[PDB]
């Protein structure tokens, strides 16, 4: 696999060398602004700086580097700044981790030669079944070891560190969010609530009415107005968005408004339902409603915190907690037999990946085609190229999966289509490629010898060799990614295209070249794939943290000339990210401590109970932290909404923000 | 070790009726009425029933046996309910389980003969290794199975029917806390804030007046007063209960005075520092603000709910968070060394148990004085104590480590203790006794035979014995404890004694009879662990279900007729348990099927991936249920505090009610 691993990075730098050397020719065409530097337009600010001359090649760096923390803030939001923050934390732990695991295990794992005294025993003139893997905590450490103490106290930096930088950033976050909060305008969210749950009216009592009686009561001087209207239904949704396609290609009527205005009155004939989004008076007042549970046994008048406009999804507004919970089950149900079907597929690629050791038996005779040529190739661009495909239909059934739960909020909602593909991704992705891999080398060799003090031995050898497979992976991500993303390239084939044969108005030429948001379903998800494989695969194969460093290193400077000058921001929910990142990094500390239980012990290091110490300060950490933060990233507090409102909050407003249409 | 068993269930069945006859007996005598029938007499309502008879002898099982629901409600609390309600569902869950179960594995389980092929193996003349014990999915049941599926299917309806219980459950403790609470009365709590973590007066102000002004503010037409004070420092509190001490010796004094005033002033001269009890106005004003973070930066102003004057653990109201934190870790970190010094002593225990493979080889020959007398009893009252004494100093510490964190209210303290208690439990006893009976008798025996197709069966033949010892356990445990509550002789005694030769006024007298609670800090840890116990071994022994219905059963008699008629509850915490409760039962079920998971794999079951499908649904369960209710259970809902309050609530009685002593 040595040829195939230089051939992919290789072939991956290649890639970058000539995506980013078009992105200093294609940018410094003027008439490229409109897909180079947007957010600059939209927000009249100028294309660029002054200007002047062609800004020297190395502009886009300095902008970036040089880019505050709070102008991020301020231009993007209070979202890029928390991206900023993941990116930079894992940046962080990877650095000294590496710096001291790096220097002293790779020295300590070539000193050895434990893949030699394997090879003793390897049937029958078995070559190229390694090369290069042994430089990583591989086969290459004799069992009993007496160096494997160092690949043990070598969990123990890897931990700390990720615990300073994880409470350090759980603060620094949270500074950011509150610093925001006190620091916005009016905004048509800070007067709401959001009732969801709410009982049917008494005898002959309007909806409206019902509701509106009932908060008047609680608090009888703050209650305003109230928003039910199941927004006209959704099939009027469906009809509206179709009179929006109407309008587009002016840029069928009378028949089709009649079809829309019949059916909304027909639906809201009986009932409204559930779902109002009572506006209040004074911000304290909604503040205090949001937090307080306004009915004992849960299952009516559910108030939450009222989402901004722009993300509300009026579509699953209704529901009635019991089909919430009904379809809470149904919905983690069928991820579960995903991530098993994904299983298959994943064993799958990494099978495609060790050619030599599958043709050796499994296909045996079917393919022995495979010569040299062929052979490089086939097991260094197909099965990565395989990866990436089925790990990126992901993203949007989950989305899908977790918006048909009934979360209100388009914000929680990528927060759970994140959460589910961390769960896919940890389990598939890892078990899979390591044990296939194993299993795969292991099975026509462990056929023969039998007891058990070698198994394990071979075991370990394929667990490092799927290692290199990762290494490649993560690579070739990085490099092309990277390059495509500040190239654009896809993007302006596609602007360039419509603004030729295509554009028909200005407006739209405009609606082409509107940017989008940092797409914060696929960005994070995706990251946490290779920060899970470059944390597990951090001890028992050091060299994935040295192209770890890299992902998320070219991260904090791709990106962020890529949400200066590009992205501009869709919702804003202040920094309620973090907690789920923060588990999740946490969570990658525990699978990484969980294997480097295993591992340590198969290469038999009796003393290998010095891991289990560990596995508990991990739950601790959690549990300890959730309690002192996730209070704060929670709820919008009474000492915000009390802060000065200069000019009288003008209500109406506020109620025809959220007006439906 | 069966004729160890005979001896302790046929002991522990004498001590059963010479105890339970004792009370049927001391009872009658209305001379005992102060300790056999007392909360029926502090709350006038006479010592029994009309006198008349003498109470026909089964009198207080029909009392008990009839006694409505919601009459315990009445008399006792919404806490004595809701231990009700817990014996009952995992009653039930046994119950059904044990139906189905026991009948088909146990005729399962005889039908076959693992244990005579094993004692094909069995060395030299290895005799009385076994016996009975050839009657539980234990070392009877071959390998490759074809019965063993049975033992699957059983996990299957063990954990279907705790889901169905748990949930059905959690409703209905749901409903009667509300039902509760909205049938309750003014209570000098539902008025009430505890704010804890408050910054430092500004240039000069006074501690009271910056409180006074910051809530002020917030709610400018509700905050009535503010109790801070840090209750004259807790040097007062030791002088005042010293003071107390007097007055009974009564039933020093200028220089105690003296030390008490001075020592109190001293402290307060500088800062009263944080904790105050903002006492609202209305009742909907408090609930709202219990229910509402006060300040973005989660560290400074943290209100509460305020608990009710009776457990408000003044003492440590003051912390900081950052101290609160602090502790918080090294206290787990306290339990966790404590669970490895338990499992030294379990050790202990599972080794005196096993005597004749103990004296094998393992202390040489130093115990070959164990003839055949001694041995019985040796292993059949012994060990059993052991493991009494050991896990009844944890109670004791356990709360004084958790009112040590912080927390603020004795009824979380006491379930904090609860649930540290349970940590304790599963791990120690269950994996103690379990692996070390199996690993001595595998120790010896393995020596000899190597490969590894007989050690896994060798191995299981030790986990079903350590499971006939935990029979034993809790049959014992059943047997004498109830006995004791029902006679209640050892308080029989210490009453009739001090009435005799101690008691120097009437006064006396009361204080001697007062009962207590029904200690929810030593009977829900303590039931714990017979949960746990009977739901491990519910499958690898069923038998350990006939033994595990009596004790929950024998519960909901006898500690009714010690509810209605002996302890008077302390506090009040309108059924603020369930949720704990609830988890542990939940995770007894999770131990359980990975224990089934282990066990059914080692008796080379290949198809005991099946059980993996349930570890899932086990956690997802989980997640939903927390969701739906715990919030319920977490706060009082603005709903019941805007119920008629006809007479207005009395304030400045209430502000009195929170004074310190």
């Known amino acids: ?33 409109p897909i180079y530097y947007p957010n600059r337009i939209l927000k009249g600010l100028e294309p660029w700086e002054g200007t002047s001359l062609t800004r020297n090649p190395f502009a886009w760096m300095r902008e970036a580097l040089t880019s505050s923390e709070q102008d991020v803030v301020n231009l993007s939001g209070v979202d890029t700044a928390v991206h900023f923050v993941f990116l930079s934390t894992v940046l962080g732990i990877f650095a000294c981790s590496s710096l001291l695991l790096l220097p002293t295990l790779l020295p300590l794992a070539a000193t050895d030669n434990n893949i030699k005294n394997t090879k003793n025993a390897t049937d029958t003139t078995s070559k190229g079944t390694f090369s290069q893997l042994d430089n990583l905590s591989m086969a290459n450490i004799t069992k009993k070891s007496s160096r494997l103490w160092a690949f043990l106290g070598a969990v123990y930096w890897i931990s700390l560190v990720t615990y300073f930088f994880l409470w350090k950033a759980y603060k620094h976050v949270s500074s950011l969010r509150a610093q925001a909060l006190m620091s916005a305008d009016v905004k048509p969210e800070q007067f709401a609530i959001l009732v969801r749950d709410m009982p049917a009216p008494p005898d002959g009592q309007t909806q409206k009415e019902f509701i509106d009686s009932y908060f008047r009561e609680i608090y009888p001087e703050t209650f305003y107005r109230s928003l039910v209207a199941t927004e006209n239904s959704k099939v009027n949704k469906i009809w509206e968005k179709l009179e929006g396609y109407k309008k587009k290609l002016a840029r069928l009527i009378n028949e089709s408004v009649a079809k829309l205005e019949t059916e909304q009155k027909a639906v809201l004939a009986e009932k ?11 911000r304290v007042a909604a503040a205090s409603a949001a937090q307080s ?72 005779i079917k393919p022995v085609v495979e010569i040299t040529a ?8 197909l099965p990565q190229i395989a990866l990436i495909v089925f790990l990126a239909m992901l993203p949007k059934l989950l989305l899908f999966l977790s918006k048909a739960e009934g979360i209100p909020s388009q914000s929680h909602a990528i927060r759970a289509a994140s959460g589910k593909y961390f769960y896919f991704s940890v389990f598939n992705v890892f078990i899979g490629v390591t044990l296939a891999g194993t299993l795969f080398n292991t099975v026509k060799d462990i056929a023969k010898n039998p007891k058990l003090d070698m198994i394990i031995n071979l075991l370990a050898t394929s667990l490092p060799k799927s290692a290199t497979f990762f290494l490649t992976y993560v690579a070739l991500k990085f490099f092309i990614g990277y390059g495509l993303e500040l190239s ?102 525990f699978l990484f401590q969980v294997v480097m239980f295993g591992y340590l012990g198969a290469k038999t290091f009796f003393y290998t109970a010095l891991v289990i110490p560990l596995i508990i300060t991990s739950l601790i950490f959690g549990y300890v932290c959730r309690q002192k933060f996730y209070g704060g990233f929670e709820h919008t507090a009474l000492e915000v909404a009390c802060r000065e409102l200069k000019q009288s909050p003008d209500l109406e407003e506020i109620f025809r923000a959220y007006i439906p249409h």
């Open 488 to 589: 654009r390239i896809i993007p302006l084939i596609i602007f360039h295209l419509k603004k030729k044969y295509l554009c028909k108005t200005e407006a739209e030429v405009k609606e082409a070249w509107y940017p989008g948001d940092l797409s914060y379903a696929t960005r994070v998800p995706g990251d946490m794939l290779i920060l899970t494989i470059t944390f597990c695969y951090s001890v028992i194969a050091p060299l994935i943290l040295i192209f770890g460093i890299t992902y998320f290193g070219l991260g904090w400077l791709v990106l962020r000339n890529q949400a200066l000058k590009v992205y501009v921001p869709s919702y804003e929910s202040y920094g309620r990210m973090w907690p789920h990142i923060h588990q999740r990094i946490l969570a990658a500390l």
């Open 374 to 381: 062929i052979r490089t190739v086939l097991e260094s661009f």
């Open 272 to 282: 409204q339902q559930t779902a109002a989004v009572v506006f209040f008076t004074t």
């Open 1 to 33: 696999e040595f040829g195939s691993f230089l051939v992919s990075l290789g072939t991956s730098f290649v890639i970058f060398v000539i995506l980013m050397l078009l992105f200093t020719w294609l940018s410094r065409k003027s008439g490229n602004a």
């Open 293 to 364: 549970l306004h009915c004992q046994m849960v299952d009516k008048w559910t108030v939450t915190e009222a989402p901004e406009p722009r993300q509300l999804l009026w579509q699953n507004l209704n529901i009635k907690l019991f089909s919430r919970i009904i379809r809470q089950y149904f919905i983690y149900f069928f991820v579960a037999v995903t991530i098993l079907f994904y299983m298959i597929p994943i064993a799958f690629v990494s099978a495609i990946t060790t050619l030599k050791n599958l043709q050796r038996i499994i296909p045996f």
